[PDB]
From a paper:
The major regulator of virulence factors in [name] is the transcription activator [name], a member of the Crp/Fnr family of regulators.
In addition, we found three new [name] mutants in the remaining three strains—Leu to His substitution at residue 140 (PrfAL140H), Ala to Gly substitution at residue 218 (PrfAA218G), and Ala to Val substitution at residue 94 (PrfAA94V). It is noteworthy that we did not manage to get crystals of the PrfAWT under these crystallization conditions; however, crystals of PrfAA94V, which showed almost PrfAWT activity levels, were obtained. The PrfAA94V protein also had one folded HTH and one unfolded (WT) motif identical to that of the [name]* mutants. However, when [name] is bound to promoter DNA, both monomers are almost identical to each other in all of our [name] mutants.
Residue numbers in the entry:
A (entry chain A), B (entry chain B): 2 to 237
Write the structure that this text describes.
Amino acid sequence: NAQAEEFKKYLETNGIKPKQFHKKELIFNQWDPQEYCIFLYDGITKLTSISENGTIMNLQYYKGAFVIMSGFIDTETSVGYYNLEVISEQATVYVIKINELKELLSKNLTHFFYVFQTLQKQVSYSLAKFNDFSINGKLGSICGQLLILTYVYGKETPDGIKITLDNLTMQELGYSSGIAHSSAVSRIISKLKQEKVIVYKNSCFYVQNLDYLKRYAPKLDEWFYLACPATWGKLN
Amino acid sequence: NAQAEEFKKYLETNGIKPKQFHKKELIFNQWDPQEYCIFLYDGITKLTSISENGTIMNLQYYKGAFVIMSGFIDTETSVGYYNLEVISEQATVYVIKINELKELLSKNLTHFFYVFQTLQKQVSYSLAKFNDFSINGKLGSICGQLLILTYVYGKETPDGIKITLDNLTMQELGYSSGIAHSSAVSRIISKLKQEKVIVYKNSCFYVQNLDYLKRYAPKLDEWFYLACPATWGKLN
DNA sequence: TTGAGGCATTAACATTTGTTAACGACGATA
DNA sequence: TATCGTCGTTAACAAATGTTAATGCCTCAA
């Protein structure tokens, strides 16, 4: 919040202007690999990839402020062919070309650490998500994904913890957990309603047994405690 | 590697001298969190985590030279509770306190960008691995892990590509794929031998149909092409 | 009001994977 | 030489997941 806003000012004082994106349009994509250093300031986006069969995969979400790399800082080559779709109504972004990045960082040292810090946050997040999505099959994958959603998009209400997210269909949850068919996702969420872990109200998800999700995503809950401890405190 | 040698001479100049670990040792562990910056210079290691009920998870392997870190750079707090076990007969490691690192990379930038490069390699590697493991179930996870081990520990032989890796049991393949029982991995392997994809010789695996593994792990093959071009080029 | 499309739910069937046990090969020990 | 433990293989069964289709609820357009 603070270390990021300080980074914003350093960008405006170097000619980097914020380019605002609206919902559903792709900042970068997998078919036109262009190496940038996206600095999502305010907004919500999802990193996706489309197989050759047209199969969709949602790798993760990004809520500003955060940094996303589409190319390497040295070789200036692509880190992978992915898409960064905007899913919030409006999201402002400070896009930076990979070339000038190496220069802007070598000047200010405190902001080099910031980008380096967020990259470490990225690594720990991927290992934890990988650890919990592999042990308990797809039930644990849905539980882990839901746990992630509750922490960064959750708010406490008398009905439970409301996950403030439009859309969030059965199809979209399946993409974030590697489930291709919507019927399979529903079959699992119908078990979580039976178990009394979640309820479906207002086309919106309320979780009531957060501990049940921790048992299926202990490494992810461990990550929020160590990486985003403020987000962890709101629910503990 | 050149960058890893300049870095190695940079550490030896500032008083950091190597340490020798033997097989089965743990550089760090998940029960005594110490925040180091591990510069694995020569040797092979696997990052693991033990769940509270005792199930092992093999997150990935590390082959020197590379950079692993158990704590964040600015806060110096743990990034996660993992074990780094030495699986080669011996390994040469340069342990450096997390605080000393901030000053060292502050003096010399070309080594700061080298550490940043290795981290970008880590991010894109985790996203790619998470992509191919989540889409095709356990068959696609075993196929993905084998693809990783061929590019890194594979060599052209008359019987295909030999995975030059010792003590690669069925358990260790399962731990890397979230499979808990060696019976399940043997079942998947007997099918890959049936389809003439691999052969089991002298407790080692020989890969004879690399293209079969690419169709089940396309983004990992893409990652080796974009991140480790030299390693990839030796098998195409 | 009627009718089209998308989403959620459930059903059923097929395939895969989880789980445990038995068999046989191999090494190592005394 | 006999005996013990480790590992791979296969089998059998239960459970989970992949796949398809049918149904009902809801929105929207005319």
